[PDB]
Symmetry: D2
Subunit: 497 residues, 4 copies
């Protein structure tokens, strides 16, 4: 059998010639017998004094923690990021100090709308989260398999998610909600085009590209700042599953990606992703035709070529899934000195949203979980006691700042980069911005004709379930993109009805 | 479209001629605009003073509560239990006072091992939970679609569940774990025979029978006690899905049962289950050939015929799924006067396990959730303040007992029934009890030959993935049941290898 | 006895001629006996099947929720705010529509550093929180008994609190921490002067003034905005306790304020506070000698006289303390249309800090607690399911925005007021701002000589326990305020040593 | 100053010649500046992108965990238990293997009814909790400073506590509740006599005796079982504070015991308690005049002399109070092989109550907190993933039992001791048992006349606040104890009125 199936046999083998450990309670007391309960005779009621049963039963009753609000179903791996090129002129980040520097990384693949225990081979954006354990703390590059997103405003993110998940009353998947939201927000036309293309159902997690998808700010030692876009493309080649084979695998192996990654790491074929950065200057950002901080826009390769940095190699499988994949927390606000946030509104929303949901799902002290600890760094601050504090609580060090007793002091060289922003402080409408140019370019320049037909057929097959007016609005947006797009989609919808 | 698909259209229609409500924050403040965020100019960073965004985003970040440890994926309905026969000679329960008495009931169907968002048409025991809102509080009849269970000792329940769920390291479904546990515990041979039969994959939730599966204690007004077994058989007839059609539906509609129930309730065809009780006396229990409190044993119909009581009709769909299906809590310890627990060890374990996991999953005050409240009863006790107390907290009533100020007093007519139990107080082994007689009876008396072939083929198709020695142990148990059973299973396994 | 002592006797009296209710479990089942447990004979072990005992015991085990991080020890009352003057030219807030409008209010008094169960008569800032139930949601005016605070930067608030609370290792009150922090941050010199004056230990909660202490933004219907400061002065007159009488009451009645308020409300003498506003224009704010948004600065009465608005009357005592005083949540971000936040950094920090700690302490759905609900308003949004959802969950209304089904729509008349802010976006130092002018004015203009002597004696009595260099730094700051201040403090410290 | 006051100075001194650590966020990123926030210019609003501020502020907002339901205010210390006598003939417990064996212990002193932050020198039972880190797990001896308790039935424990704590409506201490409960339950007459005696207010935690107060079961290697009572008397001598000095210290130093213990451990005078056991045989238990498992009864020293075992020495102060004193969990169900529970109903209730409240207050995985871990033992079981799992989660070991892969196996030598119990299974009334004999013996044999006068004066001073009929019931119980007792109490009450 494949190495995934032989987990218990392997665990037994590498534990050969050793006697089985003593079965203990949570407090370390040896268990006399864990196959029968204390009763009043052979046919009597159970007793309270059976501490072993109630202990294990309560621990069983407290096994489930809340699943992630999005990206619940996922797989995990571990490896290293190795620097292969010198970008010190762009960023003073310790992760990019010198050539050959290897930084431990933890990676999680996920599906955005699937719940815990859903099918893996479904048409849905795949999330790629990387946690670098830099000497300057953890760096969480939490990207997607697509260089863009559906919306460009964080205030729309819950609603969008609510449309992608189940109906509030029937608890069923509703194409009506999906396409109503998508047709009322034309800024999705780009990502939908990426979603229903061939790369909407990648073949496993090793045959897909990764995209930080946000503009970031790289700061060098001399204090100059540039804008950046992190890419990391698969060295195993892009490979996608057909709709029919994906539908088959959904019932054959609903855990296709997890098994694929586990077997690829267990048979030695370590997957790898090569790391690139797109770089832009400030005057280039002020002269960009679109908003360079728009999440629905890309930077064309001809104007901004990819600059290699390093490669991402995943060589270790998780020992325990829950302790290392289900409990790992990725915070985009975790950026070491040299990397900073951009005026991208979506990145601004993510700076707040992630630690909040991490304190809800895992707990206030989730950064004490071994997978979330910056174990390759030194934590020292005035943050003190919380629920489930499993450290020294920083001992008897003073817990107020400033003090006069030699407690941790701020490092003035880690100051943020300053930029002057003008204009009034209010809510600026961005729904009426450009929504069709880059979509048209991707449609008539990147895709060939058979890929266009497959894209339109997928879109129509999904959209045929919505109401007639929602279909009309969606096809109107597609026609405003390009007449062939909406024309083919409308013809296929007419054939469906 | 079916009524399930037209949820939003119907909600819009029954709200015709009404203007849309005002969009408010959680605290009721009107929202000026919820489509853009407050930035420093059109391309500026987001501000903290955007209270609307952070409010809705934090509420979105705290949307997921822990799923049920078992029976996560489920559907819900509501209706009434109507008494049609007089069993007052057996139980003084107010739910069974007089003919024609209608008691509101809330029902939840579920799959034992599937997580939230898994396939609905899978081979797995289906759980049927009923909550009666009796004037004497809530009565939770939490049964299965099978009259028995896999094990007979609650101390084995977590382990069993751990074997039925994903591998701890690979997070994959492991037939190795399943069949290792099943072959090391022969007391499963009965329920496995029920699981891999035709009724292992019922066609929706309306074409399956329900079984409290436990022995209960019925007490009359005069104080005499009898043993009972609650059945409730479907009036829509037993109907099951073929393995191929179930595998197809798993990828076609992973929410098959939810949609089926919702449509059946929305088109007027209210499903119904007829309620029966098997009754046994105390001397009959002491002269039973097996343990009458064994969960893996049934009471034969020839010796204990079914006695009709009433019928269960489900007529209302949930308004909101989460508030009424995902948050509903079923506690087998919720028994009104007249119904009591039995020396059945599994019922004893369930008496403790359920409120614990309810306080973990929902919260200490989960009985304040409207679906969990005994709204048709009067709650008055000395239980006081906890997290999320949404009542008057019983006002300024004295919170200690006994007192001298007219606080709630105990009702001496609700005392439990007394029974003397002899024998020493220790752990009694029940793994070596009878495990094959009733299994053989079900195999050679209830099933015909083609059903036997289908049973063996299903068992072999699932077992073929385990190791060779696990297959040998399983087939040895099946052969000890009956030679034809293990013989056919071993032949099919040899064909598979 | 006083009405506070006769709570149970009164509850018994107003329940005369009524039989005691039935003692029930949490699920409404009648309890046969709650004075003995189920045992194996008279001297036997307890049984698991005793559901009543384990139910009440688990509810007892889940009685404590986390105390407030600050302002834990507190008292509560309820009443109405009555408008007596027309300020519609300043704010379009529905709470200030017309003369005679009565809005229900909930008020909580508290001590900032005392834990739950500490002495009430201690030298510490007293917090005054008011929750108005306006038709436009809840308005939380969460002020102090002092018009200023110790610091002016929210990033210093945890540290300050950490210095005011117990030592991290010894768990003792440490004057060393207090005075080290206060001497390293001279911007406290003002509030310390208010803290160690006569009004540092008010006589109960009815003899103290209330101060929102922040600059707010009042917006009229025509769109013009002004800056505001909310005052509300006691109609019972300012009255303070001597140090010796306060020390006596600390051991006599550690719940002095709670009892005082309860008795004053129960004997009919309803306390009242008269509401004033200080108003400032935008050019006045740009020509203010100090920072008008500095929390350590006041607006002089000669340049900005108080403008009466209404009065605050407290007429109802809480029925249950925990359900109405311990679970009430005050969010400064709860501002109806017409009231908005100011560039005051401390108000900006409070806009975020309070809902976070409310979701931690009470739960994600704390706005469903009856005391926290905007019951005089209509809640309608797309915020959905969370832990402990005790509502309809807004039924089957669509949960995404925008939609096409008549769900709640944004009210464009509730838009925020726009202001253009210039300058770069970075951290601006405000520790070196003016720290002694208003302190000197309060010292040599408001206080007389005996009050100055009492202030210096209190400061010295508290400071004498710190180290010598901390005393030197504190007295240096006091001398930089005014030579007499530091001179008297240093003389008293020399006398103490 | 005393060593408690010089905590920060000492921390600075033992860290001399070392530069201050780098101030980091929770994720290890260096903080550029933690004294100012990011604003839009010098007088601009705060930004969301200020991750440092929101991080530390959220961690500050999640600082409070629920206080203990009882025994909230407490102090902690650490040391060793050294065996000095051979009791192997009584118990096979590894803690009592051989002479000179030193086992690490963690000790917590507490006050039963005081909340966190209340006065330490108050009349209230003092709790003494010891956690032994035996090679066979942790042993939690959780006793009091009194050999008995107020009640004898666990179903009365919440109510009692509710009477000892604040009124539900006024949130004030109510002598009415206290004495109503005490007069309605005469079985308190003994412990009340201990409570209002001289030892009701011990002088610190080093001048009080400790009592497990329960009957336990000692089992030897040969399988014979005896009944036991654990005593441990102070080697510093019994010393108590007068009522006036206690009232003074309540306002002088509300943390008297914490400071006393900290200074005694920091100046080298390590306190010590000598360990004794009272032993009883089974026939002696069946011939005892009272119930030997009654918690309100003692074993007379003449019939059951104390047998020395070892001594308890406390030599280490906690490094961080919260991580080692506030988060330490004591579970009476934690008993190593050789020590077992007794038919004492109160011990049966405590076997369940403590892990439940520990999972509520600390979390499901509270046994992973370093102070709660059995670090001197090996934990190996099938208990798996829960909220806040900070271990390997036992790696990829099989999580079901029984299995065929060498996972931890039960140790059949740790089986419990079997005893046959007769009689019916119901609730047996024990309120009408003997309540005055041992009380009379303590009154007229142990106390002298001046101690009797002080006892009566304390009882009257506390009881004078209750209603007249409650006073009559209390004095009636005291008179039924002995005529002089109730006579003096009634005379003092008449003088008070
Ligand atoms: C940066 C500045 C401040 C921050 C971050 C802050 C934070 C907090 C927090 C976390 C609480 C706990 C509330 C709860 O757990 O329910 C609280 C309570 C409170 N604060 Fe502040 N605070 C600040 C300054 C102030 C100011 C300036 C005032 C008054 C002018 C004030 C008055 C109060 C009051 C009265 C309460 C009690 C709330 C209640 O009783 O429900 N605080 N604050």
């Amino acid at each position: 059998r494949d190495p995934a199936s032989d987990q218990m046999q392997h665990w037994k083998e590498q534990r050969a010639a050793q006697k089985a450990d003593v079965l203990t309670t949570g407090a370390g007391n040896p268990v006399g017998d864990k196959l029968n309960v204390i009763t009043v005779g052979p046919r009597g009621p159970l007793l309270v004094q059976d501490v072993v049963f109630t202990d294990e039963m309560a621990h069983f009753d407290r096994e489930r923690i809340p699943e992630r609000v999005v990206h619940a179903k996922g797989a995990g791996a571990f490896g290293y990021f190795e620097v292969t090129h010198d970008i010190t002129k762009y960023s003073k980040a310790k992760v990019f100090e010198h050539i050959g520097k290897k930084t431990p990384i933890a990676v999680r693949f996920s599906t955005v709308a699937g719940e815990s225990g859903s099918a893996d081979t479904v048409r849905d954006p795949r999330g790629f989260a990387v946690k670098f354990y830099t000497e300057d703390g953890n760096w969480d590059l939490v990207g997607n398999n697509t260089p863009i997103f559906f919306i460009r405003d964080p205030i729309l993110f819950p609603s969008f998610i609510h449309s992608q998940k189940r109906n509030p009353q029937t608890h069923l998947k509703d194409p009506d909600m999906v396409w109503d939201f998508w047709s009322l927000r034309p800024e999705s036309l780009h990502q939908v085009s990426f979603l229903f293309s061939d790369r909407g159902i990648p073949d496993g997690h090793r045959h897909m590209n990764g995209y930080g998808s946000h503009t970031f700010k790289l700061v060098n030692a001399n204090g100059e700042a540039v804008y950046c876009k992190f890419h990391y493309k698969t060295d195993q080649g892009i490979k996608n599953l057909s709709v029919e084979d994906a539908a088959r695998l959904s019932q054959e192996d609903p855990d296709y990606g997890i098994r694929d990654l586990f077997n690829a790491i267990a048979t030695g074929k370590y997957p790898s992703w090569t790391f690139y950065i797109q770089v832009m200057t400030f005057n280039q950002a002020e002269t960009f035709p679109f908003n360079p901080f728009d999440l629905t826009k890309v930077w064309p390769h001809k104007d901004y070529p990819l600059i290699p940095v390093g490669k991402l190699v995943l060589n270790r499988n998780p020992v325990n899934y829950f302790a290392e994949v289900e409990q790992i927390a990725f915070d985009p606000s975790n950026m070491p000195p040299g990397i900073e946030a951009s005026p991208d509104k979506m990145l601004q929303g993510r700076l707040f949203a992630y630690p909040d949901t991490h304190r809800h799902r895992l707990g206030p002290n989730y950064l004490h979980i071994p997978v979330n600890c910056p174990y390759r760094a030194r934590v020292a601050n005035y943050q003190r006691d919380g629920p489930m504090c499993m450290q020294d609580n920083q001992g008897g060090a003073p817990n107020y700042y400033p003090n006069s007793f030699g407690a941790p002091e701020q490092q003035p060289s880690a100051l943020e980069h300053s930029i002057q922003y003008s204009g009034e402080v209010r809510r600026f409408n961005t729904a009426n911005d450009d929504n069709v140019t880059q979509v048209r370019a991707f449609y008539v320049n990147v895709l060939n004709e058979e890929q266009r037909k497959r894209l339109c057929e997928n879109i129509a097959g999904h959209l045929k379930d919505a109401q007639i007016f929602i279909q009309k609005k969606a096809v109107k947006n597609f026609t405003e993109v390009h007449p062939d797009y909406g024309s083919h989609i409308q013809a296929l919808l007419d054939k469906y009805n």
